[model samples]
Target: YGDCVTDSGVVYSVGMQWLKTQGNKQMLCTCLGNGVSCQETAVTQTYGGNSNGEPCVLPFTYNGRTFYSCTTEGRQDGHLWCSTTSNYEQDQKYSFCTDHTVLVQTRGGNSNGALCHFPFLYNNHNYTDCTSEGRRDNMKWCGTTQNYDADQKFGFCPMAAHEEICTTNEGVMYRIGDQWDKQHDMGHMMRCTCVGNGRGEWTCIAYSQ
Candidate 1:
């Protein structure tokens, strides 16, 4: 959630709610001092992809606060999440399970599921492998080490991502960047002015943070 200092010099936590939605993102609303807050309420957005992948919600505990939901990005409330991450801090990793049943942040078969598979298959299901990009070919099952397909060894890989937006006030939340909009961050106490491109990706200028 975003907080801001008013012209009268007052800071408060704002709530976030949806404004407009496009492919992967939407704008939000906020209250600067109370439920009456306006603008600046993004907690975490950044998650959107083809409708093919299953939905996921990830929670990472840090400082005993337990970063989940509004604080954590990916596959939560209105947005879809399908990325890879390390279960532990400083852990190097870059693979994630697209299936909803997979571990929140686990690797390999235990974290694998049939959520993201092609329509036509002998099993009609396959794990998202990255034999091409080494086990986790950047979140794709495009590993052609076997005859999964006669001519197309690697199955169809879905493009990953879309953008998300939200607003907040007084701990209330909703669900930025890293997808289709390609710009703007406005968050945590900034006054934002947005002008629509008529496509929902409204460009905004942040007065402050």
Candidate 2:
């Protein structure tokens, strides 16, 4: 099998992804059969086509089987995906799954009965995941729909404590804005990210987008 080796001599197997510092910035790198490919980390959320900003339904039925997590079953990009409902072959309301997984039951609305939606507009900007913007407490929150200003249905996100970084059992170090699944809690595999403050600070944000 073809493996990728970084300049620093980190060997990565095919299909592996990681973050590495390059020059003064961090890059999202993927291991390819021929070599390693790196790109700038996206500060903004990327919108997927035909998605309605709905959180995914895990253990959903697809291709006549059950998937406990997002699957790349039918994707060429290798990105994971899930149906908005329990069945994708039926409703077809599927979307790309973000790295973060919300611990609270996603099918049910939040405590405020508001369902989080992605690509939501806040302060004239678009966000594909829960955001901490415009909040005094710095806690993450999200809108129930794309037009947040018009809908006004919002709620605070379910998150855990802060941590500068998380290391995989394989010793991969993921920094701020990076996510890993080692912190899974309860029965759910919590998707965690390193959220932070300006001038030097950080912590993990656990949730699903």
Candidate 3:
């Protein structure tokens, strides 16, 4: 038979609905192939209202047939609703952007911390706060100078070869021999290579003796 017309001229049939007054209605495409035939069972509902627009309540029965309907009136922004089907059968809700906090660090170069000093030994001298000067010949020349001892001074003085040679707090000489005397002054010129573990801490490997 034909479809049922609503008060607003909207047509409702078994499994399909369309605007009868508006010729530009959307037709539901069937899954039937060329020549090959198929059948589909559908139920539809049309909604309308007064000052407050009409919305359909889902799982409704009309003309002794049961169908689903969605109410689309007075809904807040970012709010939505869907019926319980195979797709939306799970218990879940959607929400809009809410208040939240995030920890962000400003990019002030030294804001995170001070730059660590790396040390290396060249020409029997210990050099601190230095970086790799690139490859020279075959061996790696890891010092601040590009030329070999071009400054008459042996670059920087070499550091001692023992754990007690340097102090951790002041970055100065702790001891020279079996005695911890500041008189035997090795000077603050003692240098070493700073090996960074990339974990905010570094190890000082003496580059001189």
Clashes of each: 22, 8, 14
- CA displacement after TM-score superposition, residue 93 of candidate 2 (Å): 29
TM-score of each: 0.18, 0.28, 0.13
Tens-place lDDT digits, model 2, residues 1-209:
48667787655545444566689886766666788778876432223635665666554667765554566788898886766666667667777766644222122123232335566787888886666698785645766556677656565543222222344547565555776554445444465554533111334345543
lDDT string, candidate 3, 75-172, tens digits: 56532322222122232221221211111111112112111112334565554432234435221122222222442211221111221133334544
Which is better, 2 or 3, measured by TM-score? 2
Native-to-model Cα distance after best TM-score fit, residue 8 in candidate 2, in Å: 59
User: For residues 1-209, what per-residue lDDT tens digits would candidate 1 score against the true structure?
Assistant: 34544455543233212133334653343343344422332433333343233233343322322222222243255432432321223332222332232111112221121112222222334433332334443333432222233323233232211212232323221223311222236433333322212122334433444
Task: Return the top candidate by lDDT.
Answer: 2
Error of 1 at 196 (Å): 18
Ranking by lDDT: 2, 1, 3
The TM-score between candidate 2 and the true structure equals 0.28
Task: List lDDT for all candidates, in order.
Answer: 0.29, 0.55, 0.26
Name the 10 consecutive residues with the lowest summed lDDT in model 1.
Answer: 102-111
